């Protein structure tokens, strides 16, 4: 009994052609709807809980898409774009996804026509290149101008980017903190320096910016409460080496005939630890931190001689501290000298919400700070942290590039007008694709107004009419519920965000539309 | 859920390729069965029997399928067989190869409809060409008819019995012509009954100038042999029958019961002398016969046969020219069974049969097939069906065509000329059809077992 | 808060309805236009059914989602009213729904869209009646052939379209009928269609008369009658019952025999009364007993049993015979009159595909038309009879309404731009609905091109360009044109090409599509109930 | 019923195939299945593809070899042609597309002859002789024997063909960057090894911003400072940067008191001495794949030394080649001669990714790296695959020489010449050679189908214009003009060796698959 021989595995799914492509477009639209509501000064956030039961709320779309583990292949590309934009420029990852989906949405009716996708993607590439050039032309610098403080642009940039996430009504506050903080980051510019500290409890209006380093951590040994916990003008000693009785040092068997020699051996071990402690004290410092655990006895000696100590401190915060007080971490206690000894304006350790924290700050030459982030919700901790991370990284980009553009979708409207006018010049099939490009691009204000509950058709129509002639930076104003020169209203976003957004969306459309069929393997 | 919840769908080039594959397979499973060199195929039926036959139609009819286009082809084969008898030895093969070349233009992205129009033009030209290359032939001349039959049958098992087969078919068909249509009389192939009786040899089978009845004399006394019988066809039952209108009887006096009992007897008698008033010899009915009426007819020395199939009754009537009658009182001498050269009842072995032969001008006839065993006999009768079918087709059309693929090659080069004079996109499909035709002679060659390529080239050139 | 099922609201259910409508559209999107490719259905058990006529597909396709059922019923109604456009109307409905939703999918208030749609339909039908073409000047048979063969493409028989159109027009002109005293109404389905596998449609024959799918009752009874003595009889022929309850009781046995005797003699005398008239042909839906058969043979007449009632009614209408449910008179006695007889030149049973069917040729009272199909399988034959039924439908529409429309999508070709211009007049928001109506309605050329597999955007653009030119320089006697084709993949003049469609097709199509859009668009929530 | 017979029960449950039925129908059908599978693949108008593996990993692809690698196939001769194309890719680069199309066409046309009854063995003879004749005639088609070794312009123009083939949007950028790569790499370890180019994937900052470094890169952290010296002194150590632990279980032992003090102190002192000696030779940066002792990094910080970590063996090999300094398994001897030399080394941020950069200038020759930037990592996979295929193309170019006119034109000339030789063949194999010649129309056919223009008259016009010796004219890529284009001016070229090898391998695959008649298949 012979049988026909199969080509591929049993159940190898296949689906080819226009139905496959339109299915992909619909899937992208579905992904969009999961995020459509999100962006807006009156925008939105989602709550997603995992199978493990841990809740997670988010307003940044990229985080949400990470949580929405997508199985369908095409949408995985969109979620990857979300990761890309998140690593690049920040909010508008939301906007990025909406642009991608809407590009696909406008193209799909023409895909119903049997157009070879490559024509579509060629038009897309040309349009995107032209759009990027237009943005760069209408980019705005300030250091040419006169009425800019080197921070005012940064402050307003934070102002704009923030006012969609969970802390929107404290923007006038958080912008000042984040700008002043990032001003200290120079010139390493990397996020690892400034940690974020999710202290439980408290109203986030009470969240603290310290020109120094703090710990949410400690660990109880014998005397840790005994030693004084104020040090007005202290010297910081930083030990990586542990302080304990050969606890985890080199493993060795020892042999001793004379009992007195055995006595001498135990004495010599304790003399090792005493020698280390004497080196520490005679150093003249009073504060000692250690990655590795601290012997209780050494704690006792610090207590007796009024030195403060702590053990098991997480390494990242230790690096923060050493970069703060200027001292260098040490592993050899013997080679110690005053040069590697960090100094701080004042040291403390004060209760916040039941937790035992440590403080030292006021170091005039400290290029790294930290956020004590009060808040009554554990979920606020992650959400506020995400928002703050977006703020920090976007303001870093802004410092790097003195280029700003108006917000409120006005950029998108300007691009729409420019591209539509350009479309008249090129005859043939390209014209319709350019038109669809503009019609998809205009989506951003529409979603804004919809989440604002307005007649975005009146808004859009007035927008186009006024924006044909009257000024570049007119766009949606949420509170006045109509057009405004958002630029003067200080809705200021770095150009890089929108530029990268458009580029990513363009190549996303290229990728998706450049697919005809799909093969699945069990 | 949107559409139907467990209804599959498939689309486009995949569907076209799948259907073409199905058609090609359908053709392939039969490509060996054609030609005088043909193979011999036998079947396992669902319910136990054994069927062996060359005829493609039966072969396919014993095929169930899942893919639909295969079922379509099955029906096509059965239709062609019904209409003409043979050619089904070739029709599905030709269709399959037609399709196989046809698909080659699908990946040309050539849309089907234009190819279809090309096919229609091709059919028109093929019909014209074949009509140009016919030969009219006399219909009365017997030996040419026999030659035609031999030609049309020398593909199946009966070949070695060609002389007997041709004589049988000619005799049967020739003597079946209902001239009551003026000069437009029509023959029919449901009065040419075929009877399969085992034993004997093919050589023993012969045309009986009459009918065969697989029944027996009801009573010993009726003579089993009669020279010039008279035959009466009683469609009605010959016995006492239910009062159809739910009648009832309420007797009170003693004699009444015995009297009503006598009454049905008397009615039976009435029918009996009504029959015998016409001096018949033979009584036939599709219904039962009362043993009392059997008595009376015996007293009149009249042979009676009971409970015969209605079609058999019709054939007997057409044999002895008499017409069926359902009312004995309305019996007419015009329906007396005149025209029976001999009435007889023989034994084939463990079974009586009825022979009614030597009619004056019999118009009905059944063929007596006597061979080896019922399955071979069935093959024989299928072949006979095909032969007599083509014979009747000749008696409808006296035009003949040279087969053996010759007509096919004529059509081939004719269409080639038309194509090279017929520039256009449809040209390629047209010559594709032409080339597809060439495969009947090809298959002949492989079934022979010769150099197919060189032989075909020599043929075409 | 309802048990046994959840509910869906707003965007979810809107998108679901559009999704279903698009599904249904794509089910048939490949079977329209002179390059349409037919569908076929492996049922569940092998009894397949090839067909391209959309309404047939929808009926034979099981459907569960509500809106899809709505569309299916719409297709069925359209078939009950036109015959084709089930090629089209479903697509129109789905596309209008799609674009209307796309407007609503943004925010746009549905009732505004509905009002815009209503205006669009009214404007469109008015513009069509300003775009009409009248056939009265045109040659009758000419335009009839044109409309027929136009419908014949996209079907199995489009290739033989010329022959088939000839046959169809002959039949329809032969089925003339005088209506309400002022109308020459032509009855569809009056022409009889019989399928018979075997020879090709090339050999499919038109019958100048009527044809029966019946057989001779008695083999001995003759086969052909050159005389016109045709009597109809609903009244069945059996040795009669007592027919209600009449028990027969015997107290004098001497009469049972005579009782039984007349139990048949009643039918005997009825038959003899029938035959003494000289009628040689009888038909009967009721049963026919052998008693009657033998009598007929002895008379040599013609007898047929178990004929369908519609067929014999048509027989009476053709031959001029009278349907007779029984024998009776203004006086009680049961008699029969020769005036009841109908006539036809010759009646023959003939063997087509070794099955004998009964023919009736040239009834003198009223000319009848029947058509025999010849084909390979039953699949091709019954799908082509569906096609022919659509043919007769459209020709009936043409005759009933002396008015024609240029085929090949010139309709929406004009309509899109005309409605585009008219949109700006309203000034409200509804002109957006108007524009979307036009753009969606532009779907027909798109589907045409894609099924013809060429650059669809370019063909559509050229079409729109030609029509827009037809809306510039109002001296349009040399600037108004109309047309679109596929076989050469470029525009033409369908008026010259003969590609015509009946007006009522597009009119009723657009109206029903508008109603369907109004119904489905007003949806904003389904509530499910798991069964009892 | 229900019980036919078997005259051979030899099999315990398996597939026996025989009677040429499998060769005539089933095997051919499988090959045609593959042909349809990747017919859309090749073509500048060819559009990309995605597939997920059995382990649910995405693969956006246009290359045929990669996609075949991701379909776990079961029909045997399917595997035949698959792995044939696979090895072909292992040899030349692109052509997987080519060879699979060749196989499909040759098989499809051969089965037609088999049906018309030609001897299978005779089909073999005809195909073999045709392939050999085509090989003979091919060199007569070479034009534009591009000879410039290390110019950027010629090589950019050349590599444009493959890049354009597997990516139609971004020819200019990829061309210039890969050309910069090729010219930057000289013959150092022998004739421009493909392995000499490394590829890194960095998401964000779409494709246009991708760049190339004349050094080599690492996505790893750093342990001390971040500095670059215009005279950067690099030390390499395969051994873990720590005191050399004896492989034998060596437990340090003590006997009296002062042993503890002196032992810990001496450990400290001699780590200090070792790292100092390293610093004494001026080496400011050290790399190792082995474990790093905290003491060592501490002292390195004291002496301002750079550290690089967790490198795999291949990675440190790359770095060795980059700085040309010999890795030292012995921790001690920072020898002057085998000690590193780099233009600049630092740490930078791209895409929220710590990146170690060895920014370099090397006249003697260095193994450079290309930096890929953009959103979608799947697009990175596709684009880097295409770039590597182009690098292979450039390598094959360097192997010998002799660009040939692509765009099917070469193949049309092949068809015409082979046919012409066909009518001078005569013998029953004439049909075999004629069909083989016909088979080459598949390529222009495929270009048409992915181009969506009516193939037949395109091929006809191509033939007609090829009747005048215009060997440089080929299939255009333009809807407005679905007619023709002259390849040479358009610069749409390709390699002699690639076409030759693809043809030979396709021939071998065909002759193998046709040859087998009956099959045996044990249950999997």
What's a concise summary of this model?
Chain B has 461 residues and is of the alpha/beta class. Chain B has 15 helices and 15 strands.
How is this structure best described in words?
This is part of a larger assembly, with chains A (about 525 residues), B (about 450 residues), C (about 525 residues) and D (about 525 residues). By secondary structure, chain A is α+β, with helices and mostly antiparallel strands. Chain A is built from 16 helices and 21 strands. In chain A, the strands form 8 sheets. In chain A, strands 10-9-7-11 form a 4-stranded mixed sheet. Chain A has a 3-stranded mixed sheet with strand order 4-16-5, with helices on one face. A 3-stranded antiparallel sheet of chain A has the order 6-15-12, covered by helices on one side. The longest helix of chain A has 24 residues. Chain B is α/β, with parallel strands linked by helices and about 450 residues long. Chain D is built from 17 helices and 18 strands. In chain D, helix 1 crosses helix 3 and helix 8 crosses helix 9. The longest helix of chain D has 23 residues. Chain D starts with 13 loop residues before the first strand and ends with a strand. Classes of the chains: A alpha+beta (about 525), B alpha/beta (about 450), C alpha+beta (about 525), D alpha+beta (about 525). It is classed as chaperone. Keywords: tric, cct, chaperone.
Give descriptors for this structure.
part of a larger assembly, 4 chains, A: about 525 residues, GroEL, four-stranded mixed β-sheet, about 10% strand, C: about 525 residues, about 45% helix, chaperone, tric, cct, T-complex protein 1 subunit eta, T-complex protein 1 subunit gamma
Set down the secondary structure blueprint.
This is part of a larger assembly, with chains A (522 residues), B (461 residues), C (532 residues) and D (524 residues).
Chain A: E1 14-16, H1 18-35, E2 46-47, E3 57-58, H2 61-67, H3 73-88, H4 93-112, H5 117-137, H6 152-162, H7 171-184, E4 195-197, E5 208-210, E6 212-215, E7 235-239, E8 252-254, H8 259-282, E9 287-290, H9 296-304, E10 308-309, H10 315-325, E11 342-343, E12 346-348, E13 351-352, E14 355-356, E15 358-361, E16 370-372, H11 378-400, E17 404-406, H12 410-425, H13 429-441, H14 443-452, H15 456-469, E18 474-477, E19 482-485, E20 492-494, H16 495-513, E21 517-519
Parallel strand pairs in A: 4-16, 7-9, 9-10
Antiparallel strand pairs in A: 1-21, 2-3, 5-16, 6-15, 7-11, 12-15, 13-14, 17-20, 18-19
Helix pairs in contact in A: 1-3, 1-4, 2-3, 3-4, 3-16, 4-13, 4-16, 5-12, 5-13, 5-16, 6-7, 6-11, 7-11, 12-13, 14-15
Chain B: H1 12-28, E1 42-44, E2 50-52, H2 56-61, H3 68-84, H4 91-103, H5 112-132, E3 135-136, H6 142-153, H7 162-174, E4 192-197, E5 206-208, E6 211-213, E7 225-226, E8 231-234, E9 247-249, H8 254-276, E10 282-285, H9 291-299, E11 303-305, H10 310-319, E12 342-347, E13 352-357, E14 365-370, H11 374-396, E15 399-400, H12 406-420, H13 427-437, H14 439-448, H15 452-460
Chain D: E1 14-16, H1 21-37, E2 49-52, E3 58-61, H2 64-69, H3 76-92, H4 96-115, H5 120-137, H6 153-166, H7 171-184, E4 198-203, E5 211-213, E6 216-218, E7 234-237, E8 252-254, H8 259-280, E9 285-288, H9 294-302, E10 306-308, H10 313-323, E11 344-350, E12 353-359, E13 369-374, H11 377-399, E14 403-405, H12 409-423, H13 430-439, H14 442-451, H15 455-465, E15 473-474, E16 485-486, H16 487-490, E17 493-495, H17 496-515, E18 520-522
Parallel strand pairs in D: 4-13, 7-9, 9-10
Antiparallel strand pairs in D: 1-18, 2-3, 5-13, 6-12, 11-12, 14-17, 15-16
Helix pairs in contact in D: 1-3, 1-4, 3-4, 3-17, 4-13, 4-17, 5-13, 5-17, 6-7, 6-11, 8-9, 12-13, 14-15
